[PDB]
Amino acid sequence: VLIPSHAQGELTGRGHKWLEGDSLRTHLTRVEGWVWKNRLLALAMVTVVWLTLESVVTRVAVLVVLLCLAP
Amino acid sequence: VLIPSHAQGELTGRGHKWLEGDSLRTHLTRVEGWVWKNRLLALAMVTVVWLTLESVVTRVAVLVVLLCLAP
Amino acid sequence: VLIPSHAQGELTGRGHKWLEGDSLRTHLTRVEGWVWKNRLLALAMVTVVWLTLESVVTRVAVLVVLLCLAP
Amino acid sequence: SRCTHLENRDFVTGTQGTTRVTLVLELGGCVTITAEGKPSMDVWLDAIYQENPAQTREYCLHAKLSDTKVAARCPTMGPATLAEEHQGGTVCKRDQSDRGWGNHCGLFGKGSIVACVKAACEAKKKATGHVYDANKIVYTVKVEPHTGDYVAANETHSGRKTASFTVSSEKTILTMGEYGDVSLLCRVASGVDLAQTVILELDKTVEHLPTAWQVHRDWFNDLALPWKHEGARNWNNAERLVEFGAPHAVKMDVYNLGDQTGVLLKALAGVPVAHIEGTKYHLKSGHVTCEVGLEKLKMKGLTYTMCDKTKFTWKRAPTDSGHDTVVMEVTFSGTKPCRIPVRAVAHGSPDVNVAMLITPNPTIENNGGGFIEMQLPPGDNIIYVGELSYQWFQKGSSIGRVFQKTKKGIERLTVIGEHAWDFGSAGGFLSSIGKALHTVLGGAFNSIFGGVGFLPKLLLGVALAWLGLNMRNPTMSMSFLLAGVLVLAMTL
Amino acid sequence: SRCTHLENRDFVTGTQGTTRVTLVLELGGCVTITAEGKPSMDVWLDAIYQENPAQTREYCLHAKLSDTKVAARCPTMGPATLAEEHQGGTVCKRDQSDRGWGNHCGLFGKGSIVACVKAACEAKKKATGHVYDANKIVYTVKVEPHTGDYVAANETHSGRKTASFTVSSEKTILTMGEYGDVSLLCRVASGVDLAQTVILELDKTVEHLPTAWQVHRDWFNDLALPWKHEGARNWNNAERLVEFGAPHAVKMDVYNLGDQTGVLLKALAGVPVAHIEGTKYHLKSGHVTCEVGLEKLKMKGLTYTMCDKTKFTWKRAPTDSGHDTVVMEVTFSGTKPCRIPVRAVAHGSPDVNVAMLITPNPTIENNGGGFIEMQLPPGDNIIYVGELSYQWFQKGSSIGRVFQKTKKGIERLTVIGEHAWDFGSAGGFLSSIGKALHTVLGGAFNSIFGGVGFLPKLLLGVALAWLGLNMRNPTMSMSFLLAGVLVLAMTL
Amino acid sequence: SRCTHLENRDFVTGTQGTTRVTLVLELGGCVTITAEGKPSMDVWLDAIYQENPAQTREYCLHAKLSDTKVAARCPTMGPATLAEEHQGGTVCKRDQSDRGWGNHCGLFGKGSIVACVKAACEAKKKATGHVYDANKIVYTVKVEPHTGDYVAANETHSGRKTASFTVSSEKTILTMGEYGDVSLLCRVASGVDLAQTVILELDKTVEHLPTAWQVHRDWFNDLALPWKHEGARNWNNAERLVEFGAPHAVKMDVYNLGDQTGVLLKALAGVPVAHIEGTKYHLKSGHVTCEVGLEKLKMKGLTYTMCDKTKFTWKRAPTDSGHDTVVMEVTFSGTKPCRIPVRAVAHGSPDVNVAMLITPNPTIENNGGGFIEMQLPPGDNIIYVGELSYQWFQKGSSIGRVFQKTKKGIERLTVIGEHAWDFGSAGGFLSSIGKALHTVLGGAFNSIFGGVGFLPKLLLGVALAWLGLNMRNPTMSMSFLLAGVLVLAMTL
Ligand SMILES: *[C@@H]1O[C@H](CO)[C@@H](O)[C@H](O)[C@H]1NC(C)=O
Numbered sequence A, B, C: 001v002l003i004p005s006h007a008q009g010e011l012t013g014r015g016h017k018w019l020e021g022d023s024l025r026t027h028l029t030r031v032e033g034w035v036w037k038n039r040l041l042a043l044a045m046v047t048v049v050w051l052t053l054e055s056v057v058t059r060v061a062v063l064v065v066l067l068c069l070a071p
Numbered sequence D, E, F: 001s002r003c004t005h006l007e008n009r010d011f012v013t014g015t016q017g018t019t020r021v022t023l024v025l026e027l028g029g030c031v032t033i034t035a036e037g038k039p040s041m042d043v044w045l046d047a048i049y050q051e052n053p054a055q056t057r058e059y060c061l062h063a064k065l066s067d068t069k070v071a072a073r074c075p076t077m078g079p080a081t082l083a084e085e086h087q088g089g090t091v092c093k094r095d096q097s098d099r100g101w102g103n104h105c106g107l108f109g110k111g112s113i114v115a116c117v118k119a120a121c122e123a124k125k126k127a128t129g130h131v132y133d134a135n136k137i138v139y140t141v142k143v144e145p146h147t148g149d150y151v152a153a154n155e156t157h158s159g160r161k162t163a164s165f166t167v168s169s170e171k172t173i174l175t176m177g178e179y180g181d182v183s184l185l186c187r188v189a190s191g192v193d194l195a196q197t198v199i200l201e202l203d204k205t206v207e208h209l210p211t212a213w214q215v216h217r218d219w220f221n222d223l224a225l226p227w228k229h230e231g232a233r234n235w236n237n238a239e240r241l242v243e244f245g246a247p248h249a250v251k252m253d254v255y256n257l258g259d260q261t262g263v264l265l266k267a268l269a270g271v272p273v274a275h276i277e278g279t280k281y282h283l284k285s286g287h288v289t290c291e292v293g294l295e296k297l298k299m300k301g302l303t304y305t306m307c308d309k310t311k312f313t314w315k316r317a318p319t320d321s322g323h324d325t326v327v328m329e330v331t332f333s334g335t336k337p338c339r340i341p342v343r344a345v346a347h348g349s350p351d352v353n354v355a356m357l358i359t360p361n362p363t364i365e366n367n368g369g370g371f372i373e374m375q376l377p378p379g380d381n382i383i384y385v386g387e388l389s390y391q392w393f394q395k396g397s398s399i400g401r402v403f404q405k406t407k408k409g410i411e412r413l414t415v416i417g418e419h420a421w422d423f424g425s426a427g428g429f430l431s432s433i434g435k436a437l438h439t440v441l442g443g444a445f446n447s448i449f450g451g452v453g454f455l456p457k458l459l460l461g462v463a464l465a466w467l468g469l470n471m472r473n474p475t476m477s478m479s480f481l482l483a484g485v486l487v488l489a490m491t492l
């Protein structure tokens, strides 16, 4: 059923391809898609930063991952 | 020569006006205009935050004002 | 809509220009414009000087800025 | 009903005993008066105008320059003069040039030079102001009864009566067909603050512009353009559109600053427009606190029989009204006139009519009737018109409609509502205290802070808030209360 | 001499051995080259133009609107479309109105509405830009020798030779009559930075305006007006002059923003003007670093006799020159040609000639000659022309003239002088180091701070100065040096 | 009995006095109403449809491209334009290429290039949406009495009555032959949430696909494909199927993205299907809370005699029903009509009838009767029909059937059961509190977490659980309760 994407291989190239920027930036529009639809949850993850962990180096390690985990 | 703006008066209104949002947001596109043209200076004002003052309540009082001072 | 002013560029000049003094002094007639219309507020900012801060070097840093912030 | 047409609408109740109602007829609104035993009325403010008012300062937005005359003298040879250095509507500027032997002078240094142009004005480029004489202003209140018919905006309703209100009117008794009479007492004095309102007018014959505007007095009298009055041949401060270049020792160039219409139109960011119709100068934003007497009203058709319960159909199905009410239109086919058996039960098999009607005693007439407006409680409801039942789910909530009116009531309290606590009637320790606790505060922060704008109000309040953080005396630490006012009160 | 006409003038010396002089021919100036044994020359930049250059983005300052077409739909009846939502030069805006039964819709809520107008442009209201192709630009340098005649500005001098300088010119040998030849090597590449210069043009047929302007590239490409190119039928971003009111559910009003000429002319505060002459697009501000060879020059009339010491008179008496020099014109009546015995003693009956001449070897010709320019020391002086003595009091001071040139030299160091250390010739550890110590600093604070203006430079410098007052590290307390730069360097 | 055909089945009891029963007729279910003294009825929801509803946004899944036209310009020669940059249904993209001397340009750098194609749509590749108008939706409830006959699915039962339920219906009295009458009050408003339901339709003439679907509103209005409405000639966002390659300085290639049907069909993983029959757009998943009145019912054949105890045989032997009940069919040969002496004793020689019947008063008629359904207690049972005894071992347990209904009751509490606490009747502190304790919680975690999916619900709940492990305040350690909700509640 499911065909996996071929951003795994990425052999070579100086000719022509399909989507140079959209191989990376569709993953940067899903994440921006999560924010504008869930503003109540985008502010809910601010409670992680200044209240729970207080571990600045590893605060960002929770923020970036949990947004990327939501597909 | 100069005609001053009439966001000063602001009597009433339930009929029709010109620009409800653009009375405020033209002042919010000048400031966004300052940033995208002066990216090297936008990062230069980060040196105020974590290096010079270290006075979190009054760090923002320098940042917001000096951006609004540039017309 | 908005055309920004070209006191930003200021290339050169030994021929003729428009307004050598009024590039600077229209910003000095706005400020004089704020005073004569708001005499009750011009005296209200005297309460900053001798009552609240009492920090002569930085008294003027509030006075000059807050007048220039009002466009 | 005109109140069903537009968005803004307010309902006013009245019990047995409530016969004098004090409204605030704001322009571009509609008020539905409901009273127990009385036919419900729709009263709104229609128009505010004055035929041919007095006109203050004009302006010139595009200077018409002609007859450039320049004279110059050698540096020790009697500084230059002209005949046009005194005549009306002539801009002149003296300057010192650099006379050489190229332009035939015995010595060098700084020779005098002066230029003069005739500063006329371009046709149809005048910013003509206008002000309202309180003795000749004409308010206009129209009252429409809920007849049970429906009339669209293209059409004109029959029973819609119109009452003008100058300063020389105290009370108007309106013959409302068969529903009785209504009395309207309009405080024409306490309407729009006419002292601080100037009707700005450009070329009204231009197609794609508003015909007029409505600006504050202090803004209009402090422009920096050329100005005159009616009948004046020549301008004042005519140099404000004319700039002179530095001379090249024989000629000093004269530069116009072109049209100024674009700068003026950008300066009116957030100004309510005003319409000009022929000679009448209307407004599109204003209010007046008229008082409505209800003692001379009566319902129409209480002596009529009930209709047949079978013979109802629909010209138009029931639907939501956008004001948490329900509107519909039935069609009757039997003998006319008769009263329409309208009821609605929620859900208990209760036989309990919970349809709080807006149009009271709905009656089919010999040539009209059928439009029925009601307000239902939230939840599942079954609307009955005789033997004609319809399911309905009222989309509101229990606290939803109470939270609706407070969202209205706060936005009622704009600068209109700064004046208007009087939307009720004789509150005493409720509403008459509201006038006291607000006029001494609102009037105080209108004398100061009046003509400063959104951004300084959002700045100076924060500045006085920041002084609350760093303050010596705990007694003087109550300047934090201004953050409770300046950041909140005059920011809506 | 053309250098005697205008105010701005610079003298350049040259010793025995100095034969190659590197000038900076700035426009609206005049340079007098003086060399020992050589006839003195006046070299200036005359004009900078290009016949019919390529034109970039046009603009529209006054939108011409026509054919308002509005369509609307009931709130669940297929959101509104029009044929003019695709056609060229048409501004459209979609909005949600409030459809009632007044405008005949089955339901309530938010009905779609959209209006479209044909956004043409008014005639002669276009802000046409123009740019300079470096391959087709024409500099123009004129050289006039000090012939001893005098020619006013209305008249044209005989020996004034003119040399054009395109990109395709290396060196031009000019036949200067009998004074010899002069060679001019103009760096046409390193003149005005043509990459960042746009000639703005409005309606040039308007009387009381400059014909053109000279704006920065980054300013001109970041306007917020409608724009197109040459030959394009329809505009882009045409909605920037058209604003739409909130609709009243059937019609949405379309409002023009009028002319925008006034906003544009106020935006050019401190912009150097530019002239258009027919097809040629001149400039009135610029510079070029041409190099002058002096090896093929010789004085004229060393073989002539001396004049009779008695037969001199005056066409024009001696007078001040405004450049701390003295100018005059004698008239000879004997046999011509001959050399004029010019000398001037200060005060000792010393017979010591202190008249540092500017016109070397003054000679009366068969049809002209007599104009003599000299520089005298401060104090009482007696000028001799044969047997013709005149008292003179030189109005300057000892340190006054040295303090004069430094006041010149600082104002030489404008943005022209930011480029121009090369007004001398091969300084090595004087001038070639000046290029090094300034380009890496001036170029650094042009990349940043380039396009910020006077007021932020006078503010952000003080802000970085104030951080010097409150700084932790004494090593990092050298941010006070920016107050020594930002308050001083880019504030002139 | 239709309830014997399908898997899902619910039994509803009723005592002497229980006459109003509130059901939740979920589609693809069957409810057997049992009441003491009343004949048992089978009431189910049959179909939910609307003839020719209004259709919202269409889509295009396969772009039909034609007329590729490309124009390009040399890098300072007026950026490229085309006539098809404005026409409807045309995708265009501007780009900067690299013009050389190979393609004949005077300069190098970045030359403009633009291509335009006509973006039509392929036939029968449209994802046509449809929505349900609540005023025209038609629920359909069928009621079948337990007649004692049996009718298979291929056949149609005689006494099966059908009652439609639009918005314009209150109550329907159904003539159930000789069993009496039944009243059905269907809350048509509170059925399927029609505001958030869109019937998606592809090419319905395709053989091996469902004819339609049923998607959420927020999902359907946020697709990223080209779309239009009914009657619209040209598409919107037509570039979402067309991608352009980087040009080789003269031609820019235009690439279609082919059919998109496969991507759409994979996106509907776990979407309930919907059937289209001619013009009617059915559903295959939904519910409605109809209320059943039982006061106008009576048993049939109480006046009849008892049958002969000898003359019973079998058309079909007793067997399990898959609902912990027992079904069978006898055949009588004596005089008709008569009542069938049905009883069943467990094990005691007890003469105690423990056969809780489902079909009450089983009677052989003159042309039918014999189908008998009963529920027996767990263990060894002997079923008697006169003198016709059969062993039976009821396979359930004592607590097994109670644990069966709670396994039903939890899976009753799906999103249907989130609405449905009302399967009983007037619980007060049992069921009416159930509506209160669930709507404020279920509605809260539908506003947030609504449209996030199984995997983040199984992740974000564990994340908030993990914050419970490392929490400062014991008062704020009650965020572990969300692990009791988010891992459990919205994971079934
Ligand atoms: C009523 O409105 C409709 C809108 O289509 C219009 O056609 C008609 O002319 C209007 N009636 C009158 C009397 O203006």
Ligand SMILES: *[C@@H]1O[C@H](CO)[C@@H](O)[C@H](O)[C@H]1NC(C)=O
Pocket (backbone or CB within 6 Å): D102, D103, D104, D250, E154, E155
């Ligand atoms: C140039 O010479 C003419 C000849 O008489 C004289 O009239 C004129 O004044 C001169 N031009 C100027 C600008 O002075």
Ligand SMILES: *[C@@H]1O[C@H](CO)[C@@H](O)[C@H](O)[C@H]1NC(C)=O
Pocket (backbone or CB within 6 Å): F154, F155
């Ligand atoms: C009932 O189903 C059987 C299956 O064999 C079939 O023979 C019969 O035709 C069906 N009855 C009807 C009325 O279709």
